[PDB]
Write an enzyme that holds these catalytic residues in place. Structure first.
Site, short mmCIF file in Angstrom:
data_model
loop_
_atom_site.label_atom_id
_atom_site.label_comp_id
_atom_site.label_asym_id
_atom_site.label_seq_id
_atom_site.Cartn_x
_atom_site.Cartn_y
_atom_site.Cartn_z
N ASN A 63 0.81 -1.20 0.00
CA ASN A 63 0.00 0.00 0.00
C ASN A 63 0.84 1.25 0.00
O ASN A 63 0.24 2.28 0.24
CB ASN A 63 -0.99 -0.03 1.13
N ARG A 94 2.92 7.44 11.06
CA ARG A 94 2.48 6.95 12.36
C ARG A 94 2.20 8.12 13.29
O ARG A 94 2.87 9.13 13.32
CB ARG A 94 3.41 6.00 13.12
N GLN A 147 -4.81 3.53 18.45
CA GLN A 147 -5.81 3.22 17.44
C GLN A 147 -6.63 2.03 17.94
O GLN A 147 -6.06 1.01 18.32
CB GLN A 147 -5.18 2.89 16.10
N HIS A 186 -7.77 5.70 10.10
CA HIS A 186 -6.66 5.06 9.39
C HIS A 186 -7.07 4.22 8.22
O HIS A 186 -7.30 3.01 8.38
CB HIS A 186 -5.87 4.21 10.36
N1 LIG Z 1 -1.15 5.45 6.60
C1 LIG Z 1 -0.98 4.14 6.23
O1 LIG Z 1 -1.85 3.34 5.79
C2 LIG Z 1 0.46 3.54 6.08
C3 LIG Z 1 0.57 2.52 5.07
C4 LIG Z 1 1.92 2.11 4.83
C5 LIG Z 1 2.99 2.63 5.56
N2 LIG Z 1 2.75 3.58 6.49
C6 LIG Z 1 3.94 4.04 7.31
O2 LIG Z 1 4.96 4.51 6.48
C7 LIG Z 1 6.31 3.85 6.83
C8 LIG Z 1 7.05 3.93 5.57
O3 LIG Z 1 6.47 3.01 4.58
P1 LIG Z 1 7.30 2.68 3.24
O4 LIG Z 1 6.60 1.66 2.47
O5 LIG Z 1 7.79 3.89 2.64
O6 LIG Z 1 8.66 2.00 3.90
P2 LIG Z 1 10.18 1.97 3.51
O7 LIG Z 1 10.83 1.07 4.50
O8 LIG Z 1 10.36 1.77 2.07
O9 LIG Z 1 10.56 3.49 3.77
C9 LIG Z 1 10.90 4.10 5.07
C10 LIG Z 1 12.03 5.03 4.79
O10 LIG Z 1 12.26 5.62 6.14
C11 LIG Z 1 13.64 5.81 6.20
N3 LIG Z 1 14.01 5.99 7.59
C12 LIG Z 1 14.18 5.09 8.62
N4 LIG Z 1 14.60 5.64 9.75
C13 LIG Z 1 14.74 6.96 9.50
C14 LIG Z 1 15.21 8.03 10.40
N5 LIG Z 1 15.57 7.91 11.66
N6 LIG Z 1 15.17 9.22 9.77
C15 LIG Z 1 14.80 9.48 8.49
N7 LIG Z 1 14.41 8.46 7.58
C16 LIG Z 1 14.40 7.20 8.16
C17 LIG Z 1 14.31 4.54 5.63
O11 LIG Z 1 15.66 4.64 5.40
C18 LIG Z 1 13.41 4.41 4.42
O12 LIG Z 1 13.93 5.03 3.19
C19 LIG Z 1 5.78 2.50 7.34
O13 LIG Z 1 6.80 2.03 8.16
C20 LIG Z 1 4.51 2.84 8.17
O14 LIG Z 1 4.82 3.29 9.43
C21 LIG Z 1 1.47 4.07 6.86
#
Ligand SMILES: NC(=O)c1ccc[n+]([C@@H]2O[C@H](COP(=O)([O-])OP(=O)(O)OC[C@H]3O[C@@H](n4cnc5c(N)ncnc54)[C@H](O)[C@@H]3O)[C@@H](O)[C@H]2O)c1
Ligand SMILES: NC(=O)c1ccc[n+]([C@@H]2O[C@H](COP(=O)([O-])OP(=O)(O)OC[C@H]3O[C@@H](n4cnc5c(N)ncnc54)[C@H](O)[C@@H]3O)[C@@H](O)[C@H]2O)c1
Lengths: 383, 391
Positions: A146, A284, A313, A332
């Site tokens: 997603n 989050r 949540q 959400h």
């Molecule tokens: N609203 C929703 O439905 C929903 C759906 C999917 C994901 N999300 C959230 O989004 C996050 C990201 O999803 P994604 O698919 O992009 O994941 P991903 O793992 O591809 O991307 C996360 C990115 O965060 C970076 N990151 C990690 N620690 C960091 C720090 N301290 N500072 C700065 N950047 C940092 C990583 O290096 C990476 O490039 C998920 O972990 C989840 O919490 C929310």
């Protein structure tokens, strides 16, 4: 094995009989080449409501046909929930980030048969990773399922805040016109400075979508992108998130929730934002200190805040984000559109097949495995 | 001369004394090269509310100092309106499409001194062009002033409808969670087929913005785009709008209102749309038969309808689009964000200086000039009267 699966309730008026459309668009792979989930088979038709209790992620037949037990419930919070009672001997726990069964240290200690905690979506922060590492519990999620659905939701929210969509829709609905009341807090996005905290799957999808809007793009990440990609998107790199804030009109948070990002947006860091800045957060809830965000909209520091994620949540009825000024909040849902559900339902099954069959779970899906972070967990988290 | 300027009311709580931000972003020109307005001077600060009665489009000092009388009012509808009373001897009429002073055949006939009908915004369909042509009235508008503003609103509205944003927001604000109630009507936009009726300044800006969303793009227009543009955006051309409807998940209307487009969306053409289709209309309300659109949403033929434009304007309190199912409506605001107001307030002043000084009015601003459609009017319009039912 006993699989304990926590899902949200069905619609208040019952499990849908009909849907708005007949088919879903067809996608071949995710941007960058990762393939869509590859379960040996699926027992559902893409497009059906799968994350609600009656949908069961389409897993009952497969599990029961293989001699497993499937317990589905939406009652997840507290010591007397069905979830806590059934957890004591469950071998596999499954929940979705949208209605999460939190696996606290106390719950993991009591789950004496727990071997796999699976997230049916992305983001495994509702699971205590350190207790999982200490107990040798594998933590896996459906990477990329997603990420694009959330990127769309980000762009939507950004435009909505800036263009003052929500309050304007209320005036239309209520019988007014009142152009001046709608536009005294409305601007165009064009040529604004937009920064993303992280440029992972979601963050990079957002940046690509914003490019034709003619905004000035900024980013920060744990992992800097190749210079050639920065050049292609015209991005400005910032080594730290605090260095980025002050130049942006809009800030979008797209990093996971872990110790390094928890409460990053607080009364102290909010002072680094320009007056009238906008924050979009679909990552989050806990990335933001709850009351500090509300205080910044009440004081005029922020001109808007929107996102679909909260802490905890479900959010309490009285959570301050529901009613603070200029909020564009939703429950959400970005990652649980019907399209997305089909992909994570298929990936939840692929991971279970691998797990029961003794085949390796793709690395991209792993967060914790065998007493340490692993694959995407090592890439993007911290214990 | 006498300049009659119809503007919308000030906010219900008064003309703002403060704004949410300190500056506006800077832009150099419009996509394709058109320069931003070039009035000799501006008497306002960009970012201020200018289209309301107290904002006066920043024109008073300039007009009074040059010898012109400026009569500003929001009272524009009906025969007992200040507008109607003042029109008889006005030389110049200024109105914005968001709160339009309809220049029906009848009003034009009573306007004995009218020489210039200026639209502070884009879209001059609130003016009977045949009557302007007949009477030698010049019709001008501030071409490109809000085409990008509107294209942003279209993308916003396409996403909101598909992702079911509005009903979800209601759930959050009322104390709910109710995930299944929100997403039982929500999809991702990715890979859907999206088509635009017209690829002018808004339409093409819309297409460029949707490209990275990975959707399949379709279009139709009176004037075909160049093959390199088609190539570059991977567009599919449709000779007719009726050939395009059937293959689209989402249809966005971006053409002007004139006799060839009036009522194009009606009970018969709605039958060419796939079940669960979405329509976004930020062009003009009258492109759509009002009740036909409400019936389609009630019946499920359409999964959403959103726009900011209605007929007449202001829309009556009981207009059906306000409450039909799955609507994403707003009052007519896309082209009147604070940002766009500074550009059209500047462009309105540039046309007036030209007009009063005997300098040529930019060809791109002209709609009707010297007894015929001219400049942009010959390019994008067809002559006729679209003001019927304005009353
Ligand atoms: N609203 C929703 O439905 C929903 C759906 C999917 C994901 N999300 C959230 O989004 C996050 C990201 O999803 P994604 O698919 O992009 O994941 P991903 O793992 O591809 O991307 C996360 C990115 O965060 C970076 N990151 C990690 N620690 C960091 C720090 N301290 N500072 C700065 N950047 C940092 C990583 O290096 C990476 O490039 C998920 O972990 C989840 O919490 C929310
Ligand atoms: N919601 C708002 O604030 C707002 C703001 C500006 C403009 N608008 C509306 O949008 C219209 C378009 O604005 P623009 O800046 O793109 O103008 P434009 O003149 O650049 O675009 C109009 C396009 O429509 C095409 N067209 C004309 N007749 C057609 C027909 N019969 N069939 C199909 N295509 C046809 C023309 O060829 C041209 O490509 C304006 O006329 C106005 O009605 C609404």
């Amino acid at each position: 094995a006993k699989v304990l699966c926590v899902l949200y309730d069905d619609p208040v008026d019952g499990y849908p009989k009909t849907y708005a459309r007949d088919d879903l668009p067809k996608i071949d792979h995710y941007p960058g080449g990762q393939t869509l989930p590859t379960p040996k088979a699926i027992d559902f038709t893409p497009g059906q409501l799968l994350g609600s209790v009656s949908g069961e992620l389409g897993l009952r037949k497969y599990l029961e046909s293989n001699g497993h037990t499937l317990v589905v419930t939406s009652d997840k919070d507290g010591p007397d929930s069905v979830f806590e009672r059934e957890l004591v001997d469950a071998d596999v726990v499954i929940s979705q980030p949208f209605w999460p069964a939190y696996l606290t240290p106390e719950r993991i200690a009591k789950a004496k048969n727990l071997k796999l905690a699976l997230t049916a979506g992305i983001g495994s922060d509702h699971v205590d990773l350190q207790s999982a590492i200490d107990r040798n519990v594998t933590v896996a999620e459906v990477t990329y399922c997603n990420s694009i659905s959330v990127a769309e939701h980000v762009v939507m929210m950004i435009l909505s805040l800036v263009r003052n969509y929500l309050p304007s829709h209320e005036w239309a609905r209520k019988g007014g016109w009142n152009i001046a009341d709608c536009v005294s807090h409305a601007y165009d996005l064009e040529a604004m400075h937009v920064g993303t905290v992280a440029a992972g799957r979601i963050g990079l999808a957002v940046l690509r979508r914003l490019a034709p809007f003619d905004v000035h793009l900024h980013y920060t990440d744990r992992h800097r992108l190749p210079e050639s990609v920065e050049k292609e998107l015209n991005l400005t790199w910032h080594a730290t998130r605090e260095d980025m804030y002050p130049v942006c009109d809009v800030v979008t948070l797209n990093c996971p929730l872990h110790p390094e990002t928890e409460h990053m947006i607080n009364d102290e860091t909010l002072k680094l934002f320009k007056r009238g800045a906008y924050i979009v957060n679909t990552a989050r809830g806990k990335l933001c200190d709850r009351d500090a965000v509300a205080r910044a909209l009440e004081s005029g520091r922020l001109a808007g805040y929107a996102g679909d994620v909260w802490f905890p949540q479900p959010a309490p009825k009285d959570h301050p984000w529901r009613t603070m000024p200029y909020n564009g909040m939703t429950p959400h849902i970005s990652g649980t559109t019907l399209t997305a559900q089909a992909r994570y339902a298929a990936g939840t099954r692929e991971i279970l097949e691998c797990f029961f069959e003794g085949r390796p779970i793709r690395d991209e899906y792993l967060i914790v495995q065998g007493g340490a972070l692993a694959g995407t967990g090592a890439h993007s988290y911290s214990k």
